[PDB]
Amino acid sequence: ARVTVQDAVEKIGNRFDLVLVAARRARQMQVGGKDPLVPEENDKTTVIALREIEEGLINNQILDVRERQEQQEQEAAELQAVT
Amino acid sequence: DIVLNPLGVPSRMNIGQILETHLGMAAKGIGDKINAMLKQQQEVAKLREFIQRAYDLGADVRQKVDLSTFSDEEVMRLAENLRKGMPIATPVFDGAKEAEIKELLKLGDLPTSGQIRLYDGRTGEQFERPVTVGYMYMLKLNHLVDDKMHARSTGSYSLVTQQPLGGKAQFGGQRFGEMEVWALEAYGAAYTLQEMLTVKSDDVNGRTKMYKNIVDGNHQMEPGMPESFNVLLKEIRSLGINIELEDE
Amino acid sequence: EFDAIKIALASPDMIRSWSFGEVKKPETINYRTFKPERDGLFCARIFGPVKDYECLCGKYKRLKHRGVICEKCGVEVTQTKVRRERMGHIELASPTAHIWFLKSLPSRIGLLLDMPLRDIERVLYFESYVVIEGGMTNLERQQILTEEQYLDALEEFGDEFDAKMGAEAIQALLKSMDLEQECEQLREELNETNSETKRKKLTKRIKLLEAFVQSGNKPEWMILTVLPVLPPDLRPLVPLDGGRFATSDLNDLYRRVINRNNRLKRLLDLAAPDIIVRNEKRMLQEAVDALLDNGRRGRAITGSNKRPLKSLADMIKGKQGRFRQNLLGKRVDYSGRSVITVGPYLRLHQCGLPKKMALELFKPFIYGKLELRGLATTIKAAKKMVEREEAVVWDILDEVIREHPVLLNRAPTLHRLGIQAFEPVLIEGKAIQLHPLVCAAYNADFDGDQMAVHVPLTLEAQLEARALMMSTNNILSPANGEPIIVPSQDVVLGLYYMTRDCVNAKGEGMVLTGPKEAERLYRSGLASLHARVKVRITEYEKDANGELVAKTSLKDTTVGRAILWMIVPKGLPYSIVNQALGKKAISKMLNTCYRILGLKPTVIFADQIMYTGFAYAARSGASVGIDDMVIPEKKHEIISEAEAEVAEIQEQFQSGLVTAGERYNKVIDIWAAANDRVSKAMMDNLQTETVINRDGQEEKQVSFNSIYMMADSGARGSAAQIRQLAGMRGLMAKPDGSIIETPITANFREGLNVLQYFISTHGARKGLADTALKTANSGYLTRRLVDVAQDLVVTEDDCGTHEGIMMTPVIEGGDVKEPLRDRVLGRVTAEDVLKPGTADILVPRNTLLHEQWCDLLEENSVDAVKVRSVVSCDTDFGVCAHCYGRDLARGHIINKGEAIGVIAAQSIGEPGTQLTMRSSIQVKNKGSIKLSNVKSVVNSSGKLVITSRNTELKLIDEFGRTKESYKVPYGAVLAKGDGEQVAGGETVANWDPHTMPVITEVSGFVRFTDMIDGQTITRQTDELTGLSSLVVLDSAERTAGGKDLRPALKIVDAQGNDVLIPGTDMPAQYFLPGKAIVQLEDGVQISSGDTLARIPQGGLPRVADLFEARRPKEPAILAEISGIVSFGKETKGKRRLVITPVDGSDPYEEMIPKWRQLNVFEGERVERGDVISDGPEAPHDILRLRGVHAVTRYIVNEVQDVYRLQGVKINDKHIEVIVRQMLRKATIVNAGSSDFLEGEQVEYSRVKIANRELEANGKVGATYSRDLLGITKASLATESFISAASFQETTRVLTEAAVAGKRDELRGLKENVIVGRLIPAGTGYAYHQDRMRRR
Amino acid sequence: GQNMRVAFMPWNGYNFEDSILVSERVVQEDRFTTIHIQELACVSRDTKL
Amino acid sequence: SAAVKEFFGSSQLSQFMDQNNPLSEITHKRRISALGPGGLTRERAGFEVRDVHPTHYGRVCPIETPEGPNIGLINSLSVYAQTNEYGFLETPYRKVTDGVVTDEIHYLSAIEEGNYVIAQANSNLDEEGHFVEDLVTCRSKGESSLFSR
DNA sequence: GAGAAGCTTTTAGAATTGTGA
DNA sequence: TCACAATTCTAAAAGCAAAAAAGCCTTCTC
RNA sequence: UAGACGAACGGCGCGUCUUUAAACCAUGCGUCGGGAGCGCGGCGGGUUCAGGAUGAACGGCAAUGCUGCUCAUGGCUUUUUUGCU
Ligand SMILES: [Mg+2]
Ligand SMILES: [Zn+2]
Ligand SMILES: [Zn+2]
């Protein structure tokens, strides 16, 4: 549950970067099938993403490096299967 | 029966409603005494004496109602009509006076202050500060909430500009005017604004795709460019002007 | 997909290339079957199929046929939406002139040819002739002939004479003219103009020609030969109920023009005579001109009943054109309305949404969940299940609502708090339940208002609603710092009744262990809610960094204050609960809570405050009765006294000892005094009425009268209302504004009688009309501010600058209107603040002056600061986060991206609905004295007399922070000296108002230099005194012979050797004007300070005019250079006046009228920014002469005056940014090594960046003078035409852009709003920066 | 209209700004019930086919 | 037929009856409007026409006019107001002869109201119709003031 | 009948011309 | 010549919503 | 009752006639329907030329058909009144 996003804002000090980061993570959860990194409490994907940002384990850097890593492992699976 | 707010009296200087409340309380007190007499079945002597006392108080007032001429049969009819409260006529700029109101209150067994003691309905506790109770004439204006409510998910759209129709009569959407557009620009609400400008009003393929996405548990829009802008482009090319969208 | 919009003129070949076929017949449809008909305005052969994937005749229908053009009928089987995109054309038999490029004023065909407008107008409409190619004859080309002269020329000149008529002649002229040779020749001739009026004309014409040859246009494209036709589906012939048809008006106009074209083709085919073909060409011209813009020619043709029928320009123009109706604002799906009620149980991030509206707005989400759960396989089954409103749909609906926000909106969205996001709670009913606290933000009461609710669909819109627009984020206003979640009226009444004290209440003077025991005592009944008590209260100071220390002690309080102490969070003190807690006190409580603790405590605290205030307002039982309006017991005595005095004055007038006006003023003043006495008696009786005892004699305390507590808590009402209820309601003005003599001595507790009520009705009707007709003026002003400032965004962190405005406390001359603590709160210092001791860095030079730093400044008592200002920012195309400063709605520095022009315009405009629409220096306090710009000498009396027109004084405290300022004109009798100390109330100076002294720095005898007894002077002895003197006269009455003999006087010594001006070696010749009555004749040794020659003498529209930058009708003429000034020649039109500098040259001379009491004599100096004649001043002069800081400070002060007189509070950032957006152009003086013309007016950022990069090498830059435009001109004269055309003057803007061949890269907010993409301001800043990074 | 019994006091914020707090006894007695008569026209036309 | 039907059916001053109350009907019938064909307009109306003139007294109500745009132009006609043979509003007064206040009713128009001193309705009368107190509040030339008996 | 043939706002800015030197 | 100034033509004048009614060229047939 | 015709074909409708293709209308009556690409030809429509109102050729398109290869199967304007700012 979320009433205020000030704790989430304090760890991304723009308040317009928060919207885009949380949108990326929430779209991942909703469509990408990714598993939430925090327990679900009958929250929606947007609130779950904002809670994750509040905890301090999602931001632009973490998302970028995770995307790079998973793309690299999928490519590595291709490479192992083919060579 | 009804509870109003005292704060509407000082700023909105309508003292007439408090005076109406007091005089209505007095009238209903007279009617309550008449009902008490007319219930514990009495004789017409006491009723005519009391109604005469009620009709013959005040300063030197125009009307003289004498019940010695009423033949004792329509005095009971009059009392039956008066058991709901004695009607009172208070002409516009020569009406009653607070002394007359206090005298009429004292005719009944009401307090002259106009304010009685009340108790809380759900805690049984006396409110402090005696409150002004009385009878006020309430009107029901013809602005009913079941004629004002209206909502729409989707419907039909105009021909020339593929936008929702406007009105409750022809099922239609709300105008998101330019002042609301400014207020959204004053936040950082760029995506809300884009969706309200394209996928909820004009962009036809975008809004069909948005519907199909929503029903499929996916919340994402295809931007597109509004059809009203194309209508404007054609309306401007129909002059000699040649307005064109440059390359990528 | 695209980056810009290019506007230009359409060639006939280009129009033919847009076309799909050429329209020939006026007819539209058949009326047997409503299918189209060939070569009509609706034609399947031209404009595409009627039905999808079908041929009109019916031959081609298969999927294998998509594309084939049928041979039977010629239609192309394809989508019918193609009707919405295909244009035709009409081949006009004769060329025709486009109305816009002819009659736009300026005329783009007029000045291009240099011909005047009316001659071309006569030529086009076949009323006269025009020659071309004069040849070897004495007739030039562009001159105009007429019928008789044409006949004469033709008979006397052979075939080699081309004289044509109508648009064909205009086209021939336009095509024969070569552009390059004319441009070069006229540019060459321009250099020898000598700077007369004609120069301006030339710099217009050239600006056309070059701008008309740089782009790929030719002149003859302003004359129509082929005419496009709008696609059929944009001018539809919809059927209706019956056999008729609801046609559009464009169809009628096209039918008319096609009719006339066909007739003209017929006549030209059958070799008609000249008269009839002339008439028909004229009529076709009129038809086309009606089609393109119906009404610019003679009276607009009327369609059917009485209404001029719409043309294309009408469909583009106006408040109901495409721009303002369908692109800048739309109708939207997923939206609803209803009436609003109050829900006092909600938390302030919630609203109550009816179940019916919720189910109607969230249908697709419900379908999604239904198909997800499997409760309905196909979509139609889910649709029908929802239509039957089953028992499972409601749990789904409660699951598609949990954390999904909705936007609530009230009709006039004056500022950005008229839209807010809430988390719906489903409610059984039909009205939306709105939280009580957010009602102030909306300006919504609950007497019938409605509210519109919108649903955000996409995921980013939900995040934006949850993060930017949620009602728990918007607790502070953006117009100022102050909160907007202050409790309104019942909460404050409850907290004022609860936190109060009675001098002897039940259970007084016992000792308690804490708030909890106080509450138990009160609830159980053993004590009164406000009885004085001792309570042990533990309060937590968070003085230790991130650490709370819990002080405990015994405090003398009341039971109600102890009960209220429970809500208050940890960090706050007990000094905030230990008072009466009116409205301002609660506002300060919430403010300090926010600034100390944070956000979440403030939100929870506000909710708890609302709950407890409502609860204890219910418990109090506060009512209002008739016996709570206590009349003064002494009212009739005062009224009898005042009436007797009025009768005494009336008797005084009846005997004719007084006039009318002074009787009027005596009456008005005595009645006003009586009114004030009655008011004072009423309030003194009311406020302290209650008198009560503790243990003996009666003490007295503050009144528990209901109306007193209502008007004292700040809950509702003010002293004026309590005045009108109890004391007399005073004096009323009639419609003319003349105050009626007889007041209304009756008050509303008693009755007004008929006459008094009638006067009250005068006043009431005036007020209601004023409001109802000023709402629109405020709306127009707000629109203009938004459309000038909308494209200004914060786009950098630092410009790297030191310049900034000098902010000081603002004093009109009495008490300080508002301190320095309020001005520079949240501004960034530009140049460092020095400790008042000596040259010590007190705070660094890039601090954000928050509460700590400002309090430090206050305790150290700094006089003023220099702060970074937006108008002085060197960032181009936006501002930097530091010059703007703090985000007002938030607590931190402004974020990169935020759009501050829209919020500035909204802050200035929203309070516009509260504004209206229709001696000697007596010091106040004791302190040191200072003066500046003072030129004075000692007189015989030992005082000091001043010889300057800009002299002032300050009374200053013992710390140097100024307290009082005043202004002293030329020649005042100073009562003290500089640097001394005075006493409170000590008069410091005095003057003689109506006379203008000519006091001398020197003294001696007088010389009668150059007077003729009868012309220079006319003796007029002071008959009633006895003595006589000379009376000098002006130049407007004497004869021409003595007119040049200027009447003057001079002071000399005994011997006559001229006494020279002090400081130099020249005599002091004091030249005088007329009416300069020289009382002191020769033989009188004068003294300094002696009068040589007596010289006897809005509301909201004010703001609108200040932002329009309108020059007044009596401007205070300023001075341009230093050095000795002089008079000029003897009044050729205007009295000439010359200035002479010392370092510079003296060609400068000004043409001043003869209706000004000038401030300067011949023998006196001036300076840039001096006044030559007082009066209201022009901002243009301030910008040109004094500077840019001068004009911005001037405008800020003169707007804040209006906004502070009404009790409104706006920050000074907003006016500063609107000023920045006004002064935005610049005219180049020196072309330099750049490519700018002699006097071209160019965007200031353009020349700034141009010369900035040009000075990379050693070349020279340019010189510019900034122009001050209004808000209509500053927004119309922008570089982007899409913005300007959607605002005002669509025809002018589009013609200018089209002939100029302009190109619009969007770059703005309104432009991206129209084309339906992300604005480059908020959450869309990142995407636009990304796009700019890929170029 | 109808002549109702009134008390001028605040009550738990339910008559906060201009709202009114009615009792159920006003609705049970149908003191403010009104009758509204609509009209609905079905017009059968001479259409093609 | 076309002209009379155009007047009665589709005209600015021939408007749909306001009918949900007897008061609504009766006060719609006694309604004066400064708009219409031959009158001014809502936006072209200044403020001197939007206002209560002193000669409205007894002929036009000051406190019954619709709020919003057309305030002051949709005036309502007083209880005793009437009309001359020429079309000017008039209102009834009682002749006051020789101090005694008789009961013959004269109907005065605005251009006759200015040549008399009209006493006030609630000015006290004693038996046989004298003014009990020796000086009364009146209005003589578009302005109220206090006059001898 | 059905189907065509064809008589009053107010303010303000910018462009003429109409004397005026 | 080249400058003020009276004329006059052009633009603009808040937002949102509810209900109702009247209409959607002249005319010329034979 | 059935048959035929009405810009290619089929059903249905409508109009007309009775073994016949006419008459009616004149982007030659109305509504609906054709699994697709390549290939064969070509109703219909046009280009060129001549001939002297007539005729030869033509392939960008293309109707009833034929063989073979590949594939999932829905309203706008004016007026009036009202409501909230
Ligand atoms: Mg309201
Ligand atoms: Zn076809
Ligand atoms: Zn800066």
Author numbering:
A (entry chain K): 2 to 84
B (entry chain I): 1095 to 1342
C (entry chain J): 16 to 933, 948 to 1126, 1136 to 1373
D (entry chain I): 797 to 845
E (entry chain I): 499 to 647
What does the paper say about this structure?
Lambdoid phage HK022 contains a cis-element, put, which suppresses pausing and termination during transcription of the early phage genes. The putRNA transcript solely performs the anti-pausing/termination activities by interacting directly with the E.coli RNAP elongation complex (EC) by an unknown structural mechanism. Cryo-EM analysis of the putEC prepared by promoter-dependent transcription initiation, transcription elongation, and LacI roadblocking revealed three EC populations at sub-4 Å resolution: (1) the putEC (3.2 Å-resolution, 36.9% of the EC particles) that contains well-folded putRNA, (2) the put-less EC (3.6 Å, 22.4%) that does not display any well-defined putRNA density and (3) the σ70-bound putEC (3.6 Å, 40.7%) that contains both σ70 and putRNA.
In the cryo-EM structure of the putEC, the putRNA was located at the opening of the RNA exit channel of the EC adjacent to the β’ZBD. This location is consistent with the put-inactivating RNAP mutations and potentially would restrict the RNA hairpin formation in the adjoining RNA exit channel via electrostatic repulsion. In the putEC structure, the ‘V’-shaped putRNA binds to the prominent β’ZBD by its pothole formed in the center of the ‘V’. At the backside of the putRNA-β’ZBD interface, the N-terminal loop of the β flap-tip helix makes significant contact with the putRNA with an interface area of 281.6 Å2. At the bifurcation point of the two stem structures, β’R77 locates like a wedge to separate G35* and G36* and forms a cation-π interaction with G35*. Instead, the phosphate backbone of the putRNA is located near the RNA exit channel, prohibiting the RNA hairpin formation with its negative-charged surface.
